[PDB]
Amino acid sequence: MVTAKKDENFSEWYTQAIVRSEMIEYYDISGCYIMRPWAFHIWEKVQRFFDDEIKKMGVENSYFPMFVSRHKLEKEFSPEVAWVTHYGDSPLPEKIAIRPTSETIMYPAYAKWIRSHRDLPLKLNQWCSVVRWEFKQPTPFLRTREFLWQEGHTAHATEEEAWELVLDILELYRRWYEECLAVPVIKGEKSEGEKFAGGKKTTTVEAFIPENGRGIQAATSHLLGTNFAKMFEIEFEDEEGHKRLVHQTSWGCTTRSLGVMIMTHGDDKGLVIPPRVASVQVVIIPILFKDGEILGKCRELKTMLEKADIRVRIDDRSNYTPGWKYNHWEVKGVPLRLELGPKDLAKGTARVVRRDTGEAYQISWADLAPKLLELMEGIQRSLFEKAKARLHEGIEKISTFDEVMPALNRKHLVLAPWCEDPESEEQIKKETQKLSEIQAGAMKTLCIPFDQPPMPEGTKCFYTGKPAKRWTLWGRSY
Amino acid sequence: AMVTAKKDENFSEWYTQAIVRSEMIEYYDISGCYIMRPWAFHIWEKVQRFFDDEIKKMGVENSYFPMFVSRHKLEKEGFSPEVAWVTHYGDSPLPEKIAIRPTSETIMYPAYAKWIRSHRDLPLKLNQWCSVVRWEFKQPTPFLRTREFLWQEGHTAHATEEEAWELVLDILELYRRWYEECLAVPVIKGEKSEGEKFAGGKKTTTVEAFIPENGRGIQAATSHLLGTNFAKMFEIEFEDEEGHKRLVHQTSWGCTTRSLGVMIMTHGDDKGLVIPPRVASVQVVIIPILFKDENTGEILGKCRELKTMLEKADIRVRIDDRSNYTPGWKYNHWEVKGVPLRLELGPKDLAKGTARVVRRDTGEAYQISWADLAPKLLELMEGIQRSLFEKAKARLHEGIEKISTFDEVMPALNRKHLVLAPWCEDPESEEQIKKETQKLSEIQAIETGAMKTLCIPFDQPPMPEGTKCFYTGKPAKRWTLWGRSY
Ligand SMILES: Nc1ncnc2c1ncn2[C@@H]1O[C@H](COP(=O)(O)OP(=O)(O)NP(=O)(O)O)[C@@H](O)[C@H]1O
Ligand SMILES: Nc1ncnc2c1ncn2[C@@H]1O[C@H](COP(=O)(O)OP(=O)(O)NP(=O)(O)O)[C@@H](O)[C@H]1O
Ligand SMILES: O=C1CCCN[C@@H]1CCCn1cnc2ccccc2c1=O
Ligand SMILES: O=C1CCCN[C@@H]1CCCn1cnc2ccccc2c1=O
Ligand SMILES: [Mg+2]
Ligand SMILES: [Mg+2]
Ligand SMILES: [Mg+2]
């Protein structure tokens, strides 16, 4: 049972929801959390979706070691890297690092495997864990010191083909968030301050948490250019015979995704899981009080529902009350609850409640599969749309710096015309830190959206005064 | 690039050649760690999906617990020298060092003690896929013994021993499948001796394999009946239906990337790898008989058509349309990699509406009409799969000598065979037999020699009454499988 109100104390709400749903268990090593099956099975679904998709692009999976030697890693962040120094009581000759990211592990093998134009495109992915000693406050899913991710890394003959892939991947991240988790996101380009300094252009998919006004990078996909190619000597021979540097990409997305889905659709009763990723779509609860028939129809219903590929549990555990079950599967966010007592049995009917609105329906045995399929689409589409609206009511389109803090104090992002000059962003981060401080924080660029509004002729940068270039989305962030 | 070392003559170099030249493994600067490229990784994905679908059917659920465990928690209760310790992040010293997981009992079991309070919480059945780090003292081998390796580990808790034991055996059966049905590697189910079992458990069942080229047995996977000692240690108790506090009955089980190695070694030959059709990335490689004399479109058009037609029958296909290599170059390339079937399509073939199919395991050739390709290739794949298994099974049973007396031991070892012997199962004798076989192996060493128990097989050959222990001379309980091992 959940008692903190999503709209009052958000961080306590979140903790209760992830704990009492049995998604997360607390752990003694700071920044690390145990992922219990209810949370893990959802990761399995997004993992499979993404994995299948990238496979259709010819990306292949691999596994590179979790250790990188010191001199390889330290060749061109630093404070977050975890170092192994001993085995038993014996010190290693040279300390070794646990993978924070894999560029320095993968790229020397690339330099080696890539020799001609015939060896391209090389497209590889891996699913693994990563360790970073995050200095910021940890949060289950969103920011953990060990997290699970995929990282994709690719090499191409031309910038054209690599950029095409950057976008294809970005679009798969939209789909992971938008089609699987029903979380709206905004495609965009990172400002030169926020991008991966190893690359030429970083693209992003960005999300928003209404309850605390924080934007959050949902995933990332980089046009690396050739900088890593010169650094690692990844070059090939073209059609002619001239040696050329490859054009690279990398891209990653994490268990952070689960966190965002939980915050987006969660309510005061706990989780709400979208049907496309719910391990249990429909839970069937037999009502039993004061004394056998019914258990038999329940089983028939499951088998019916499974021909529709509907994922179904029967909670027929006799050591729990029906009301306990109601509450349990509610807090866990099961999309549909199908009840069945004596009175229903004779009617040939079933009482079904949907988790997102609490609405109830009486539905005859014969109408279940198509009606539940109907209802499940509605829940999914409906969670997305209520979140898309929340997202858009959360962004304020604006023209001057004096608009900012009021918008930030309403826990909103702002969309603003900016000249995209280095200094401004840092000045904006600091002045906003200072105004937040004294109010007793900082606002950064989240992205430059692909979907640009029109920019009239003499429109000015909302902060410098210089002439604006494009519309940039700003806010407080994770 | 061909395989040059002969499998039977220069086994070690053969192994290194086959895994490298086939593009399965790339070498790496940290010892005992290896890169796994797609060609090997894909196989790990196949066995992982298989095993995973099966345990889910049994009510096991997946989870992810942290790779870190505190020193206090790991050291709660000769494993100690293998643990990797993190002492610093960036330039900053930790308050205490932290261990990278070598196995997950000391991370999972305190959580089990929390979650389990009542009979209604039972059974609890979890699994996790993850990597494990152990600073192995022995010489590293790609797949078979690595300092980082991938595995699943399963850990379950039950109200009764009976239900735990049942699970231990259902799991063990899934390990047999993993090897026999997926990788086509024969294995023997058995019970470890007192000396070889997990010391944390009451009984350890195992699935054992045999590598003929070096005569050494190798443990393939493991499944333990843990009893109640861990529940006692970690305080995993539940109130039963009458409110009495009972200890839970536990199991754990694991299988690793080792299994890919066992598969490579079992089916490989002098040309290189042979991959069973059930787990090969590519089952059929289509090779167009082109030189860069031309590309008129006629032959590739048809290769595309065929790919599609086979792809509809769930056959995994690749066209090697690379313009700078001869067909013969390409035959060898895909042989080294172990693609079970090679489809040849040349102008002659195009002229007749046929294609020529060659199977990697025997080299036999088949002329097949386009229309008959899908069903005929499926048939050939079942045949390949079955035949790889049958041949390995016979090499396994030809590698075991049933014996009666200790005098028969060293001759049986020198022929690179295992031995199956009546054994009293007293624990001092296992140690004594290890020592004696070590000393005798050194002495007849011309230039790991110890013979140990591998398992007491579930499949027991007959035991005529009054049979004596091959070593002690006391009455012999059962037959025990022994050998040199990894
Ligand atoms: N500690 C973490 N825990 C979980 N997810 C993370 C963590 N750090 C990053 N991510 C996610 O993984 C994606 C790719 O990682 P990466 O781009 O290396 O992150 P990053 O540059 O360190 N972001 P940030 O730490 O906020 O500056 C990020 O865009 C996040 O969505
Ligand atoms: N270093 C390794 N690399 C790959 N696979 C391994 C490794 N160590 C163990 N395995 C496999 O993992 C299975 C279960 O692990 P576990 O029972 O902990 O092994 P173990 O007791 O360390 N075996 P051993 O080291 O030979 O005494 C073993 O039965 C092996 O098949
Ligand atoms: O986005 C990704 C994900 C895919 C591959 N890597 C890129 C960028 C990684 C950026 N990054 C992020 N934190 C780090 C921490 C320590 C060392 C290095 C890094 C580091 O390189
Ligand atoms: O068999 C398995 C596989 C299933 C899960 N774990 C069990 C027991 C592993 C035994 N083991 C093996 N090497 C270790 C090394 C260091 C510390 C502890 C251990 C250790 O406990
Ligand atoms: Mg970071
Ligand atoms: Mg950053
Ligand atoms: Mg051992």
Side-chain angles (χ1 to χ4, degrees), chain A residues 2-75 77-93 95-191 193-226 228-229 231-288 290-296 298-342 344-346 348-422 424-428 430-437 440-478, chain B residues 1-76 78-295 297-381 383-438 440-486:
Chain A
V2 186
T3 72
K5 303 296 143 220
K6 182 173 199 191
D7 76 356
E8 269 166 10
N9 193 337
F10 185 45
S11 52
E12 292 181 12
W13 175 80
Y14 183 57
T15 290
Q16 306 194 321
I18 74 197
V19 166
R20 281 154 209 206
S21 62
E22 300 165 323
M23 275 200 154
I24 280 295
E25 181 65 69
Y26 269 89
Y27 195 61
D28 70 307
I29 297 191
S30 197
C32 302
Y33 314 89
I34 289 170
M35 253 178 90
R36 306 181 64 175
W38 201 245
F40 198 82
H41 283 236
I42 300 195
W43 175 246
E44 289 192 324
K45 292 267 186 318
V46 284
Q47 170 172 74
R48 170 72 68 88
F49 166 78
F50 189 74
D51 201 63
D52 287 351
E53 283 317 304
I54 69 179
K55 272 189 198 346
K56 298 178 208 157
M57 307 163 69
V59 173
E60 305 185 325
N61 287 344
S62 49
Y63 190 71
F64 294 69
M66 61 162 303
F67 296 124
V68 53
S69 67
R70 192 187 177 169
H71 75 105
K72 274 200 214 302
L73 174 59
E74 296 184 328
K75 205 196 138 201
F77 287 36
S78 267
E80 290 166 343
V81 172
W83 292 99
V84 180
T85 60
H86 291 74
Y87 64 102
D89 294 335
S90 314
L92 289 162
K95 65 181 182 171
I96 282 156
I98 303 165
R99 156 176 75 214
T101 200
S102 291
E103 286 84 358
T104 58
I105 295 160
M106 299 175 64
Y107 295 166
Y110 280 42
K112 175 171 169 160
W113 296 325
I114 291 167
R115 262 315 105 77
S116 80
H117 61 273
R118 263 168 285 266
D119 295 319
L120 303 176
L122 164 71
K123 321 195 201 169
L124 296 174
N125 181 69
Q126 66 173 20
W127 291 97
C128 63
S129 98
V130 173
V131 172
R132 294 171 188 181
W133 223 259
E134 296 293 336
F135 277 59
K136 285 180 193 192
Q137 174 95 6
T139 297
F141 304 111
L142 309 180
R143 190 169 287 283
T144 60
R145 295 201 180 165
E146 179 190 23
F147 57 98
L148 304 167
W149 84 353
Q150 55 67 222
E151 53 184 316
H153 299 258
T154 73
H156 312 260
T158 56
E159 160 150 315
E160 204 282 330
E161 192 185 73
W163 176 249
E164 162 190 52
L165 196 137
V166 172
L167 299 177
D168 287 340
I169 292 298
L170 190 76
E171 158 69 0
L172 296 180
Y173 292 145
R174 183 195 65 77
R175 289 179 63 203
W176 175 330
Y177 281 88
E178 299 204 336
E179 304 189 354
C180 300
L181 304 172
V183 171
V185 296
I186 298 162
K187 293 188 187 181
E189 185 181 304
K190 288 307 213 180
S191 71
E194 282 295 288
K195 72 167 204 197
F196 184 35
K200 179 192 165 69
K201 188 165 292 142
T202 290
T203 65
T204 188
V205 93
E206 298 274 334
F208 177 58
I209 317 298
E211 284 78 354
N212 64 15
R214 314 205 83 89
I216 188 163
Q217 180 161 205
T220 196
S221 182
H222 310 289
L223 169 67
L224 303 163
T226 57
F228 275 123
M231 195 191 321
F232 277 99
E233 289 185 74
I234 317 171
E235 40 179 20
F236 63 105
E237 295 198 12
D238 58 23
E239 326 305 298
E240 331 322 317
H242 310 139
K243 294 158 129 292
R244 302 221 212 96
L245 296 181
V246 293
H247 297 268
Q248 277 169 280
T249 84
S250 62
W251 21 283
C253 183
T254 71
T255 37
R256 165 181 295 188
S257 62
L258 268 58
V260 175
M261 168 218 88
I262 291 154
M263 289 176 169
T264 295
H265 317 304
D267 71 12
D268 283 348
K269 273 160 216 206
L271 309 189
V272 181
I273 310 310
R276 285 162 185 191
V277 300
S279 179
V280 181
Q281 288 167 328
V282 185
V283 61
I284 292 183
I285 304 175
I287 307 298
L288 288 167
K290 200 167 187 326
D291 225 4
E293 290 257 19
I294 58 194
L295 300 191
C298 284
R299 273 189 286 275
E300 284 178 281
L301 291 191
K302 175 158 158 202
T303 302
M304 187 190 165
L305 294 161
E306 289 171 13
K307 294 164 51 175
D309 306 313
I310 285 169
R311 307 187 286 271
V312 188
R313 193 167 185 298
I314 300 180
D315 200 337
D316 64 342
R317 296 175 279 182
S318 56
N319 299 131
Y320 298 102
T321 61
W324 179 88
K325 299 188 186 181
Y326 295 166
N327 195 104
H328 185 243
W329 303 111
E330 172 178 297
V331 183
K332 289 156 94 59
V334 175
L336 295 170
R337 161 163 100 253
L338 192 173
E339 291 146 8
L340 199 65
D344 303 78
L345 180 56
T349 189
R351 178 161 193 274
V352 167
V353 187
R354 56 189 276 172
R355 178 59 182 84
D356 62 336
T357 56
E359 172 163 347
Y361 313 71
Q362 298 291 315
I363 299 169
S364 70
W365 307 348
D367 298 315
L368 274 164
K371 181 60 171 177
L372 295 189
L373 276 173
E374 188 175 294
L375 284 174
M376 283 197 313
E377 278 305 331
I379 299 173
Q380 189 81 32
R381 182 191 168 284
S382 182
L383 293 164
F384 177 71
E385 288 302 349
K386 293 176 184 209
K388 193 182 203 278
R390 284 195 306 267
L391 171 58
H392 279 76
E393 285 125 29
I395 308 164
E396 288 173 33
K397 197 177 171 182
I398 69 145
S399 321
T400 42
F401 193 55
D402 291 297
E403 316 209 55
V404 172
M405 300 298 314
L408 296 185
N409 318 327
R410 265 181 306 279
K411 287 149 63 201
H412 284 170
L413 311 173
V414 310
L415 188 65
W418 181 41
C419 60
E420 305 180 30
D421 127 280
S424 64
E425 167 155 47
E426 212 51 55
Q427 298 171 333
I428 294 169
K430 281 164 288 168
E431 195 160 337
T432 54
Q433 186 95 81
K434 276 64 204 194
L435 293 158
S436 304
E437 266 158 358
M443 183 182 93
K444 66 199 226 151
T445 55
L446 295 168
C447 76
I448 308 173
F450 288 165
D451 180 25
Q452 281 287 310
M455 183 63 67
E457 308 319 291
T459 312
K460 299 296 183 181
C461 162
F462 83 124
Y463 174 86
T464 54
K466 302 214 261 288
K469 231 141 185 297
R470 286 173 299 178
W471 294 88
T472 304
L473 185 65
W474 305 68
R476 305 211 169 109
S477 71
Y478 277 89
Chain B
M2 313 179 77
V3 171
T4 299
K6 298 291 148 52
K7 197 184 169 198
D8 55 2
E9 306 161 40
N10 195 1
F11 192 51
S12 305
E13 196 174 353
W14 174 87
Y15 187 68
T16 297
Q17 277 181 10
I19 68 197
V20 174
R21 293 169 188 211
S22 62
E23 297 161 302
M24 278 190 166
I25 285 304
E26 178 65 60
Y27 268 68
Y28 191 68
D29 77 321
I30 292 174
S31 182
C33 307
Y34 306 90
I35 290 158
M36 291 195 57
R37 303 177 70 165
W39 200 256
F41 197 69
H42 168 279
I43 296 173
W44 175 251
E45 300 176 286
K46 287 287 177 182
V47 302
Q48 172 190 253
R49 181 75 70 77
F50 169 80
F51 182 77
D52 202 65
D53 290 345
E54 295 297 315
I55 60 186
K56 280 175 156 92
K57 279 176 190 154
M58 303 170 41
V60 196
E61 297 187 324
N62 281 344
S63 56
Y64 193 69
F65 291 77
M67 71 175 279
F68 291 123
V69 55
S70 74
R71 194 262 327 142
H72 171 71
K73 293 188 39 171
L74 180 71
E75 290 184 333
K76 174 166 160 97
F79 292 144
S80 286
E82 295 169 6
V83 183
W85 287 104
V86 171
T87 53
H88 269 89
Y89 57 110
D91 276 327
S92 306
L94 292 162
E96 287 189 63
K97 65 183 150 145
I98 291 162
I100 287 161
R101 128 201 90 213
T103 184
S104 296
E105 288 80 351
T106 58
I107 298 140
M108 292 171 91
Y109 301 168
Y112 279 37
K114 189 202 210 269
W115 298 333
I116 299 178
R117 286 294 124 94
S118 147
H119 60 286
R120 76 194 46 182
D121 304 308
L122 293 179
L124 173 67
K125 298 182 191 202
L126 302 170
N127 180 63
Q128 69 180 11
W129 299 89
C130 68
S131 62
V132 176
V133 175
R134 306 183 181 179
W135 229 251
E136 298 292 335
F137 191 63
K138 300 176 178 169
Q139 204 202 42
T141 322
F143 300 109
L144 301 182
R145 184 164 305 276
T146 62
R147 291 196 171 164
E148 182 193 15
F149 60 93
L150 298 175
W151 79 358
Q152 48 75 220
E153 60 182 302
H155 297 266
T156 76
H158 314 253
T160 64
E161 184 143 309
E162 184 207 331
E163 177 191 289
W165 178 235
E166 176 197 30
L167 185 140
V168 157
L169 302 168
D170 289 334
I171 295 296
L172 190 61
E173 173 55 7
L174 296 184
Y175 290 141
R176 191 194 58 78
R177 293 184 81 181
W178 184 321
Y179 280 88
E180 296 192 345
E181 295 177 2
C182 293
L183 306 177
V185 173
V187 303
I188 297 167
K189 298 191 192 183
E191 178 180 311
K192 288 288 175 179
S193 67
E194 286 297 304
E196 288 292 304
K197 59 171 220 202
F198 187 35
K202 154 160 193 184
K203 176 178 286 160
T204 288
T205 64
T206 183
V207 88
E208 294 294 314
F210 168 72
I211 284 85
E213 279 71 2
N214 63 24
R216 327 183 57 106
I218 172 153
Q219 174 161 0
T222 206
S223 182
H224 304 298
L225 169 74
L226 297 172
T228 62
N229 201 62
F230 274 113
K232 195 169 129 63
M233 189 186 310
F234 282 98
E235 275 187 52
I236 312 168
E237 321 177 292
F238 67 95
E239 288 189 5
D240 70 12
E241 305 184 2
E242 288 74 19
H244 296 94
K245 277 207 192 319
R246 305 323 191 173
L247 291 160
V248 296
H249 298 267
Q250 281 167 270
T251 78
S252 67
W253 19 279
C255 192
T256 76
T257 35
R258 166 174 299 188
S259 63
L260 279 58
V262 177
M263 176 223 67
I264 285 150
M265 290 186 289
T266 301
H267 311 301
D269 67 20
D270 286 345
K271 301 166 176 44
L273 304 178
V274 190
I275 314 310
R278 284 183 194 158
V279 306
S281 316
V282 177
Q283 289 167 320
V284 175
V285 58
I286 289 163
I287 301 188
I289 311 297
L290 290 167
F291 296 85
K292 191 145 192 307
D293 52 24
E294 188 85 359
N295 186 10
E298 292 141 299
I299 272 167
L300 297 181
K302 210 80 186 110
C303 292
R304 296 183 215 299
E305 277 164 359
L306 297 174
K307 183 173 182 311
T308 292
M309 175 193 109
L310 304 181
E311 272 187 343
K312 286 165 168 184
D314 304 305
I315 298 181
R316 300 192 287 291
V317 188
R318 183 161 296 146
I319 310 176
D320 184 349
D321 69 326
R322 294 174 291 174
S323 38
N324 67 307
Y325 292 110
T326 72
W329 193 86
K330 295 181 179 177
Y331 301 177
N332 171 77
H333 181 75
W334 297 101
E335 260 153 19
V336 154
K337 298 171 71 60
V339 170
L341 288 159
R342 149 170 106 235
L343 194 154
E344 295 160 9
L345 193 83
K348 215 149 184 284
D349 305 296
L350 209 70
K352 292 197 189 149
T354 61
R356 182 155 171 283
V357 175
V358 182
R359 61 189 276 184
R360 173 66 179 78
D361 63 327
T362 54
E364 173 167 354
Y366 302 81
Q367 289 292 143
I368 302 164
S369 47
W370 296 338
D372 292 3
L373 276 167
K376 180 55 158 147
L377 292 199
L378 290 174
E379 203 190 331
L380 289 182
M381 279 181 323
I384 304 287
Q385 186 77 21
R386 178 67 68 175
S387 172
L388 288 177
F389 180 75
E390 298 307 336
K391 289 174 200 176
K393 194 195 187 27
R395 297 185 300 257
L396 166 61
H397 288 101
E398 295 154 2
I400 306 163
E401 282 175 48
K402 274 174 101 179
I403 67 168
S404 312
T405 67
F406 185 65
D407 271 6
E408 297 172 87
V409 178
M410 300 304 303
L413 301 181
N414 298 147
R415 291 196 283 282
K416 304 185 209 308
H417 290 174
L418 303 176
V419 315
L420 191 56
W423 186 43
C424 60
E425 300 183 22
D426 109 79
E428 194 189 51
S429 67
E430 182 172 7
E431 274 301 307
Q432 294 169 325
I433 289 159
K434 273 198 270 178
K435 284 153 166 131
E436 182 72 347
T437 45
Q438 183 63 243
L440 292 162
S441 295
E442 280 154 1
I443 288 155
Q444 67 178 72
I446 287 194
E447 304 185 352
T448 85
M451 185 181 77
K452 77 173 202 193
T453 64
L454 298 166
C455 69
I456 301 162
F458 291 6
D459 191 356
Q460 285 280 309
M463 185 62 80
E465 258 182 348
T467 294
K468 300 289 160 196
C469 176
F470 81 129
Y471 187 75
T472 79
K474 274 128 64 178
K477 297 309 97 189
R478 299 177 287 177
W479 297 87
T480 291
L481 187 61
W482 309 69
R484 300 213 176 104
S485 65
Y486 277 87

